[PDB]
Design a protein around this ligand. Sequence first.
Ligand SMILES: *[C@@H]1O[C@H](CO)[C@@H](O)[C@H](O)[C@H]1NC(C)=O
Ligand SMILES: *[C@@H]1O[C@H](CO)[C@@H](O)[C@H](O)[C@H]1NC(C)=O
Ligand SMILES: *[C@@H]1O[C@H](CO)[C@@H](O)[C@H](O)[C@H]1NC(C)=O
Ligand SMILES: *[C@@H]1O[C@H](CO)[C@@H](O)[C@H](O)[C@H]1NC(C)=O
Ligand SMILES: *[C@@H]1O[C@H](CO)[C@@H](O)[C@H](O)[C@H]1NC(C)=O
Ligand SMILES: CCCCCCCC
Ligand SMILES: CCCCCCCC
Ligand SMILES: CCCCCCCC
Ligand SMILES: CCCCCCCC
Ligand SMILES: CCCCCCCC
Ligand SMILES: CCCCCCCC
Ligand SMILES: CCCCCCCC
Ligand SMILES: CCCCCCCC
Ligand SMILES: CCCCCCCC
Ligand SMILES: CCCCCCCC
Ligand SMILES: CCCCCCCC
Ligand SMILES: CCCCCCCC
Ligand SMILES: CCCCCCCC
Ligand SMILES: CCCCCCCC
Ligand SMILES: CCCCCCCC
Ligand SMILES: CCCCCCCC
Ligand SMILES: CCCCCCCC
Ligand SMILES: CCCCCCCC
Ligand SMILES: CCCCCCCC
Ligand SMILES: CCCCCCCC
Ligand SMILES: NCc1cc(=O)[nH]o1
Ligand SMILES: NCc1cc(=O)[nH]o1
Ligand SMILES: NCc1cc(=O)[nH]o1
Ligand SMILES: NCc1cc(=O)[nH]o1
Ligand SMILES: NCc1cc(=O)[nH]o1
Ligand SMILES: CCCCCC
Ligand SMILES: CCCCCC
Ligand SMILES: CCCCCC
Ligand SMILES: CCCCCC
Ligand SMILES: CCCCCC
Lengths: 334, 334, 334, 334, 334
Amino acid sequence: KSEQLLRIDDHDFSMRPGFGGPAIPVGVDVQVESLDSISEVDMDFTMTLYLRHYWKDERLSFPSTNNLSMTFDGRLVKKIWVPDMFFVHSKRSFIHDTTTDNVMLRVQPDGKVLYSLRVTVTAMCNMDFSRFPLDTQTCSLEIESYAYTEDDLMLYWKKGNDSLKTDERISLSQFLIQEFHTTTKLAFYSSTGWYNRLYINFTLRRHIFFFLLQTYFPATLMVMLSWVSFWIDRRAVPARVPLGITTVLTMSTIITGVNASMPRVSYIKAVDIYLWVSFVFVFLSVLEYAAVNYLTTVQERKEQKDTHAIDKYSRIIFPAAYILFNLIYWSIFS
Amino acid sequence: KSEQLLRIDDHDFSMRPGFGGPAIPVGVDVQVESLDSISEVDMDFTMTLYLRHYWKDERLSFPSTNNLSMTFDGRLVKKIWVPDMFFVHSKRSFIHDTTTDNVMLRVQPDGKVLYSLRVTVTAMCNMDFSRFPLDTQTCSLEIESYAYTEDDLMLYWKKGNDSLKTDERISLSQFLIQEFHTTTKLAFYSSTGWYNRLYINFTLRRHIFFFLLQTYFPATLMVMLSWVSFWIDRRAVPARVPLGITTVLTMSTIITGVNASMPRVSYIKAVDIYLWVSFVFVFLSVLEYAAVNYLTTVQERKEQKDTHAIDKYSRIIFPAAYILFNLIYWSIFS
Amino acid sequence: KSEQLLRIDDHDFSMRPGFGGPAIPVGVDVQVESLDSISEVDMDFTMTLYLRHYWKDERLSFPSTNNLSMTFDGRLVKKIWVPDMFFVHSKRSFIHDTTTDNVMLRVQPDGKVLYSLRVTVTAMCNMDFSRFPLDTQTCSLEIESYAYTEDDLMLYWKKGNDSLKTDERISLSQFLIQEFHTTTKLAFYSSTGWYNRLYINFTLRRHIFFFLLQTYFPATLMVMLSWVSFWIDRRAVPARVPLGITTVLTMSTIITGVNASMPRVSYIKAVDIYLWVSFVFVFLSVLEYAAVNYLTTVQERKEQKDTHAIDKYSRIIFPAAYILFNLIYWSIFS
Amino acid sequence: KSEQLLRIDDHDFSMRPGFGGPAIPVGVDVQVESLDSISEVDMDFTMTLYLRHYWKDERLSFPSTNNLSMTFDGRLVKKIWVPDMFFVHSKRSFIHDTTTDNVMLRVQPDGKVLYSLRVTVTAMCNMDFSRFPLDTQTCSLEIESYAYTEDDLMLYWKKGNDSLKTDERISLSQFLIQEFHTTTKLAFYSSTGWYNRLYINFTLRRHIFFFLLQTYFPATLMVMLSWVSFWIDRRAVPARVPLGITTVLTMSTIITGVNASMPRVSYIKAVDIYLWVSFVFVFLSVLEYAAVNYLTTVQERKEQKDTHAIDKYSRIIFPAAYILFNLIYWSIFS
Amino acid sequence: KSEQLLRIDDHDFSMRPGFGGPAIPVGVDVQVESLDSISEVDMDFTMTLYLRHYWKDERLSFPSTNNLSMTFDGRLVKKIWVPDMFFVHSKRSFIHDTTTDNVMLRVQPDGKVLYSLRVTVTAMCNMDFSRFPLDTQTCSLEIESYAYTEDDLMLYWKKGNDSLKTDERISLSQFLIQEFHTTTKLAFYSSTGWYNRLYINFTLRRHIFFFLLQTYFPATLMVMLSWVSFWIDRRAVPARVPLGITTVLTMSTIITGVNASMPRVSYIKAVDIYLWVSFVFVFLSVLEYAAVNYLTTVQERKEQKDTHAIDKYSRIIFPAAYILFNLIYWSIFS
Ligand SMILES: *[C@@H]1O[C@H](CO)[C@@H](O)[C@H](O)[C@H]1NC(C)=O
Ligand SMILES: *[C@@H]1O[C@H](CO)[C@@H](O)[C@H](O)[C@H]1NC(C)=O
Ligand SMILES: *[C@@H]1O[C@H](CO)[C@@H](O)[C@H](O)[C@H]1NC(C)=O
Ligand SMILES: *[C@@H]1O[C@H](CO)[C@@H](O)[C@H](O)[C@H]1NC(C)=O
Ligand SMILES: *[C@@H]1O[C@H](CO)[C@@H](O)[C@H](O)[C@H]1NC(C)=O
Ligand SMILES: CCCCCCCC
Ligand SMILES: CCCCCCCC
Ligand SMILES: CCCCCCCC
Ligand SMILES: CCCCCCCC
Ligand SMILES: CCCCCCCC
Ligand SMILES: CCCCCCCC
Ligand SMILES: CCCCCCCC
Ligand SMILES: CCCCCCCC
Ligand SMILES: CCCCCCCC
Ligand SMILES: CCCCCCCC
Ligand SMILES: CCCCCCCC
Ligand SMILES: CCCCCCCC
Ligand SMILES: CCCCCCCC
Ligand SMILES: CCCCCCCC
Ligand SMILES: CCCCCCCC
Ligand SMILES: CCCCCCCC
Ligand SMILES: CCCCCCCC
Ligand SMILES: CCCCCCCC
Ligand SMILES: CCCCCCCC
Ligand SMILES: CCCCCCCC
Ligand SMILES: NCc1cc(=O)[nH]o1
Ligand SMILES: NCc1cc(=O)[nH]o1
Ligand SMILES: NCc1cc(=O)[nH]o1
Ligand SMILES: NCc1cc(=O)[nH]o1
Ligand SMILES: NCc1cc(=O)[nH]o1
Ligand SMILES: CCCCCC
Ligand SMILES: CCCCCC
Ligand SMILES: CCCCCC
Ligand SMILES: CCCCCC
Ligand SMILES: CCCCCC
């Protein structure tokens, strides 16, 4: 019997190998299969990957005439001792079990053990949307032992930076993924001790042109369209008056639609400043003609008892101010 | 064997230590890892944390030549006696189990036991939105024993206020978190007895300027824009008439969008009063010109058979009334 | 050992106490902790509560020198016999298990047993929205034994109406809860027999003023605003014409927003009648001026080859009809 | 002991009764408790019901002096042999387990067995929305044995059509349920053999008047309102021009709202044809006046160098065409 | 006993048949039952199917006088050795278990075994929406062994292309399914070795006419309606001015509604180009009349101190440019 060549009943597998002595080293390899989703409101991402472990245990040695290793499944895991890695700062995770548990075990004749499993994990990631939609985000995934400190278990990447592999077809619907690399660091708990921690890092970016076309183009078009009133005859009140209020209504509807399209992040972003500055420009364009009309009526009544200079100066002042605002805005936000 | 140094089979672990005598004291430490989400419609929040227990049991003592403690996992938990803390007023909760159960056990040679586990819990919190968006909310998390009254188990914070730790990077997308502290209180059940309860408290706040810019600015702009009609010549009926109805339409669309953006809380809030008062002002601005036009037509027909005084008085009355309303409103709602 | 004082191995716990004889009485107490949510589309509600059982079993008696009772947990439940209550007309439910099963057992020396557990349940409730938003709903929760008929198990409230307790801070975001009381009734199954059933009843109400302000106010304002056209000079066609169509557009947008705000209940409610009657009034106000203008043009052309009487009669007829409709509507719907 | 009167250890319950001989007949009864929900996008429905089984097994006979039957629970199910019915074409299902498994067993002294359980199941149903909202749907639920063909197990309704019962208060929020009946049929699998299958059928209908009032009324009102322009003086260009474009805008907003209100079924339905035909009529009403105005201007310029006939003919042609379209449409779609 | 004819206790079922020798061949058959849903944001699909396995094991042979095979359930699976197939690139999956596990076993007297189970699986699929709504997508489902390489287990389709069957009533609400076929390929893992993989492929298509009618028709209608202004008298400023701004508002609302209706794919698609080109045309139509009016006013003022040529040329230039754009667009996008 396979479980009789291995002396399962003769050893206490509730304790780590080398109990009471130096720490046992464990090597780790990771292969990333896919990135499933990302949430901007809850600030988390989902990943599916393969996790592998490497260690040696003399209690699992068996006599053999050659180097043929045996293979087992998740049923033997509950009997032998195995590491207890967990994902730090994770929200939820599970191990796939169809059509059975995705667990394998390979034992060398001298006692070397390979332990692999397939897992999906959701982890948190703090994001800053102040520079939206020109922002860039960085995320990380962390692995650590739960029960054993550095004095009992030593955790490291088995092959350095070569221990990380990624699928050729990994992609996201609305982000660009790049710059995968791994690092290590020591963690401290005030009541427990010191622990080793591993990291996997990557970066995300957006598509700029889509957001530009969807947001900045209509606002600029409406602002430029509001300047048309400066060239219409001032005597045509029933034509000059409705144009401004209709432009205001159009801008308000555009802003409402843009707000409805974006995720519910409740603080000021870069796009809001541009939109509301455009709204203020459209607002001032309406008061200009009211002032002009009042002055014309007062002059006519006084006379009773040619282009106005305000239009002539507005035709020059408004585009220059808009260009200056655009220059400052695009110099600040790169 | 580790489970033979501990006399597992020689003791009845179905009863608490010191059964039939004084209550056994248990100490508790908590470390908060993250706040996951918050719901304003269901009135609850989600938290992930570490929970630790401290107690002594002579039945778990083992002989040793030094102070080296043993370490175990969740498999030994089902055999020995452990406390039964639960979260009061919680909706749902679970213990993480990837890649295995996040449970540890450390036993001192003299019988002192440390028991720790990692858990995510969702708890209810009553909220009042009468002062939205200038409201402030307070939340609490409660811990209590389920089966043992104060005559059998005594629960306390092990190190007073030093028993609570929070992560350095805890944050929320739309709230500001502050003022973490712990308290204690006694609870009474009419059919069961008295129990000790522990509390963890914190406060939440919003970003005022975002809501101000998104809501109060356009309404004030539209109200000020409606006053322009008071300065246009009364003889230009086809210019005076459409302006009011278009302003009414714009205000209605703005109110509809604002209502669609907010969560579905079905009672009156502070913002609604401001919005509907602005709507009423815009409404009255339309009836003013109708009265003026009717009076002018009646006068002209009588004569057949200069600014009107109503406009002159409106130009002064409307802004003063709006300023008085703003002063009263901002004095009441701080 | 505790499980040896109780003769667990000497008795067949697969059969109820007093098997083959009279029915065994069981008492029930309930404490309501919170109401979690309510769905108007799926017609269900969620509740969390404590459930307690009382019965006597001589097979669990143990010798003792005093009245000290023993305490156990969910592990002993799988060995002894326990009642099998279930929730009738429920959709889903579960028992909390963090950090362990929320189950307790207390056994008196003479054999009296107390059995308590904590559970969350979702139950259906038929609702009628014909009188929305002035409707009132009544809901109930039902408890019954699954396997044992009244000839084998007798179920009753232990202390009558005093067996129901409710939390002091139970509340809902959009409803008012009142009138908790309990009743009993007998149930019949054609293929199984008769069963006892228990009931918990309560009532729900809404906030009227919020819905009034959000719906009835703008429609009335628009209807009153449409009457302004009756006082404008009939010769100002470019002013009379756009007002009606703009009012129609505003009313249509308001109705669309109100429909989008309400839940998807696909049959006629009270508010829809009011909204569409207002729409019909606004519609007729437009045809009135078309008739007036056609008559004026015909008269002028005939003459070629002062207020119109229609306006004079409309100024009186329209408000009277609207007031009559309001009186009838508010007399029918209380 | 109850489990010793039944010779559990003396029989191999891994094989069906009468193994190697004729098929064993099994009777089935069903009682429907409620219909929980229905999805028009995923095309499925949810149901909760009671399922009962009837068969005889001599291996479960016990000696008794009378006809008193014994009662058991789900614990005995794992030892004795039971049928293996499953729901064909189902997406997900589960058995209720609060406060324990909803399973009962009753065994007669001669070996007759009754087996009942409570289950919730979600099943698919193909739907056709071409005639929306005047469509009618039919759904079915299927029961079949998984492992045993007709040569080993014979499945039938125990009492014919009397085996189906429905709750008195079953209802849906947006559908009308009627015509419950049962049928039987034989199923064939190319690689396994023949199987018996049972069916439960019902029909669903909608509320016509709600959809009529919400959709067809405003479109007809707008189409009739667009005809007003035919009676206004052609010389009033600033009154004739805006009316058409404002009607077009109103119709577009109504269509957008109606599309937003309906579920996301991505193919043409009956309502879309009506809406777009109305839109085309409103579109043509605008080109009519443009042609009239161009002809009038050309005539005036020629003369420089009374109602137009087009209006006179349009006043007759447009309503007749609309009535003909309505007659054809309502004759085709019943 | 059935489990005593099979020598369960006499064999070590932790190792594959023929351990230490040549690979054991396993045959696979699949029957597709239904396609449940498809997500365009998460890029995945859900499928329900039957999975069957074929292999021979001499350790399960039993003596029999005829060719009668025995039948078992999921309880025997935990004792005998079974293959360990899993779904590659899957997100989540489960095995149905109502009213019991959907697992069957049939063993021939000579040791041939049939193993079948029912499973639902969700798998990822990369999609490209650049040609929306004229895009075409291809999807695949993959099956592979987890623990055994090609040197230990050989996987193949049992009957070639005849091993795949599909239900007669499989359909989707918004897609057309076609072209089911199977393929095979070898997979390599750098740290584990080589594996055999199986594929199931199919194609999806959309309904073109629905999207055409919903999107392209109103934009073309609005563009054609904007050309009407070229035929109105230039002296009617209060009629020429509002038409353009109202058309702009209508186009903006249509674009906002279309964007709200589509799924949140954040990059440029084919429809957006058409919509924004139409918007630009409508925008230029407004500047044309502003230029014409300014020139007319300048000429009149100069004279103080007939159709304009711009209109005559625009009437020809605008439709020709629109037709050229349509030809190029529909030649590029087929
Ligand atoms: C791994 O490679 C990355 C590439 O950016 C580098 O930053 C990092 O320092 C490397 N780490 C090690 C341990 O070599
Ligand atoms: C803990 O500190 C908080 C800080 O606000 C204080 O309110 C509270 O009383 C302290 N509790 C104890 C037990 O010292
Ligand atoms: C309990 O009190 C309620 C209060 O409304 C009453 O209606 C009911 O009849 C009472 N029931 C009993 C059993 O006393
Ligand atoms: C059951 O009754 C229904 C009622 O419509 C009928 O159609 C059906 O044929 C009946 N079936 C049997 C088996 O009697
Ligand atoms: C199966 O049939 C498909 C039909 O398209 C074909 O492409 C494929 O090559 C065939 N495969 C085999 C193994 O015959
Ligand atoms: C791809 C379109 C880019 C448009 C940019 C507009 C910036 C104002
Ligand atoms: C944080 C600065 C915001 C400024 C917004 C100005 C809008 C007119
Ligand atoms: C609100 C517009 C008033 C314009 C007055 C201008 C006085 C110079
Ligand atoms: C913002 C333009 C102001 C122009 C003022 C001109 C005064 C003669
Ligand atoms: C950061 C913008 C604040 C705007 C406040 C407006 C109050 C009416
Ligand atoms: C609770 C007072 C609400 C007052 C609203 C007034 C709206 C005009
Ligand atoms: C509805 C407006 C009527 C105005 C009448 C004014 C009489 C002084
Ligand atoms: C609200 C302004 C009223 C002004 C009335 C003036 C009467 C001469
Ligand atoms: C609290 C505001 C009530 C408004 C009622 C309006 C009824 C037409
Ligand atoms: C059930 C009667 C509905 C009447 C609606 C009338 C809308 C004009
Ligand atoms: C559609 C309006 C027609 C008005 C005709 C009135 C004839 C008295
Ligand atoms: C609904 C008002 C009708 C008025 C008719 C007056 C006829 C002289
Ligand atoms: C209950 C209102 C029915 C309205 C039908 C309108 C059909 C055009
Ligand atoms: C399937 C025929 C659709 C016709 C739609 C016509 C819209 C003007
Ligand atoms: C686009 C409208 C043109 C009208 C021309 C009519 C020529 C008879
Ligand atoms: C659709 C109405 C056309 C009317 C044409 C009349 C030509 C004299
Ligand atoms: C079935 C209606 C097709 C409409 C196509 C319109 C293309 C501009
Ligand atoms: C990728 C080319 C997009 C061009 C869009 C032009 C919109 C006017
Ligand atoms: C913004 C429109 C200006 C038009 C000027 C035309 C000069 C030839
Ligand atoms: C896009 C049309 C331009 C027409 C220019 C005509 C100059 C005489
Ligand atoms: N390193 C994991 C861990 C367990 C614990 O109690 N504190 O940290
Ligand atoms: N203290 C927890 C608890 C259990 C119970 O039955 N009542 O309260
Ligand atoms: N009283 C519960 C029950 C079980 C059953 O089969 N019918 O009703
Ligand atoms: N009748 C159920 C079933 C099982 C199987 O493998 N094929 O169909
Ligand atoms: N072939 C499945 C698998 C397991 C593993 O560790 N790598 O790939
Ligand atoms: C906003 C422009 C006002 C001009 C006053 C001279
Ligand atoms: C609402 C203003 C009315 C003025 C009447 C004199
Ligand atoms: C709807 C009012 C019409 C009046 C006809 C005299
Ligand atoms: C659409 C109506 C056009 C009329 C041309 C004579
Ligand atoms: C956009 C058209 C402008 C014409 C200038 C001559």
